[PDB]
Design a protein around this ligand. Sequence first.
Ligand SMILES: C[C@H](NC(C)(C)C)C(=O)c1cccc(Cl)c1
Ligand SMILES: [Cl-]
Length: 553
Amino acid sequence: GKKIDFLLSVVGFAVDLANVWRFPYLCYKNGGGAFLIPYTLFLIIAGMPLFYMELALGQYNREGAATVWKICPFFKGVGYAVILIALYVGFYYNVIIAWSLYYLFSSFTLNLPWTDCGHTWNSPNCTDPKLLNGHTKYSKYKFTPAAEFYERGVLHLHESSGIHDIGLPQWQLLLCLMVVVIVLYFSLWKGVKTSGKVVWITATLPYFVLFVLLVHGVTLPGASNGINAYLHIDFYRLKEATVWIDAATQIFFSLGAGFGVLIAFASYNKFDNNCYRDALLTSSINCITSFVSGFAIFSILGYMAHEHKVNIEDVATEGAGLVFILYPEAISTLSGSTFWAVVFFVMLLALGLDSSMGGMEAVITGLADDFQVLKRHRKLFTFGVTFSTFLLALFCITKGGIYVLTLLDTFAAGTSILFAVLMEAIGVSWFYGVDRFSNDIQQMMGFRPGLYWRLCWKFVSPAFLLFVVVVSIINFKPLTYDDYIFPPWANWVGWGIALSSMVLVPIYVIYKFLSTQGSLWERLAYGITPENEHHLVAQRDIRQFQLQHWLAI
Ligand SMILES: C[C@H](NC(C)(C)C)C(=O)c1cccc(Cl)c1
Ligand SMILES: [Cl-]
């Protein structure tokens, strides 16, 4: 049964709320395969090596995201940056989980609220395909019963004029978020241990849901056109860099790299655990799952396009909520729709709780390895972190909360996470030493990494990461939500949010340089040498001050 534990771990870590909620709308907004080509390319080239590197670092050093930088003290700033990114991304993940909980609560009925309009939340402009024969010519529709429900009875978005009029928190999403927060705190207040029990059903269910989605949606009146549009590549779309930026960000979202979660999780792994097999299996399963999810999503929205007599590009929204408009629509066409709705939204709740727990545990471990006081008081520290997250998510459940959620989803971990991962790779590979990293991996697992891994770690991955980071800055599209154009100050606030975590690296480098005592060269030596080898500095034996270290692969 040794292989069973391994397989369970890899399947559980290979599926995330990212793959199930963020990948659908990114794939739909970016062509639908013109997004997969960059996705697969980046997956291999950058995601596999960086996932492997993070796992190996966490395993060997036995430290969290922040404290693992005792190998190179100058990058504790990068550690703090990834911790802050994980904290930022934890303000709207809980809001998404609250939406899932609300949908699950609404699913306990024999007449689902998203099947037709005629309720209190339905506008006069609703069009029901079943109650009638069947437009702005470029809009995102918004007049379907499912979209009407999502945007009026759940978000109450019709009571906000923009991000400048967010309003007051909704008292229903308020209770949902309170329940989610309480569950997270009570699942994180005792310790890191949560595996080897009920996590069995939080990893198998997503695959069953995806499988049933495929088998059913393949046989739909309009799924053929959706599949055809999915399998058509538009290279003029590939010549824009928006798809490339989205692919990189979604990759680092789904694989978990750049959030400090992998390092913290691996810090508890057995010293002789195989990170290479972990990386290979997780990446392969992630790629296959992403392809299948794209196929199912495009089949469903092709069916919608056939049902609403609307072009495929206008059936559904291109932002957060695409899954909440899609899955109800597909469920309404299944026999016994109530059971399937319950199962689907229970799966969404389980996945979201698992992901939120992972991120919160990453933050807590990163900040607790640094300070012993917080380690001795896990309960109070967890309560404080959870309360802060609860308030900053309260900010995102207002009437105009979708605008804030879009701003965060766009700016919290975009160029910021790309820069953090680039700095991690540069730090390790160049300053600490790819040769030293390979020696550590050999000491741990028994075999030295191949040439492909070393080349990707040292040259290729940093190069493409830097290219994407530069392109995402020189080619920045002002934020928008469907047909709503954010005001310029919203863009300024988003860029400030990104910089808040991007600037911790140079600030910490400056702080470390000033704090250390000695001359310039001595300060540099203490700054780039591992903490446990500071005795060599007095002997004037620094490897980084030799060309052999820099010209070694
Ligand atoms: C991407 C991450 N999940 C892993 C690392 C892939 C397991 C996640 O969903 C997350 C990241 C930061 C904060 C919060 Cl709340 C959630
Ligand atoms: Cl993904």
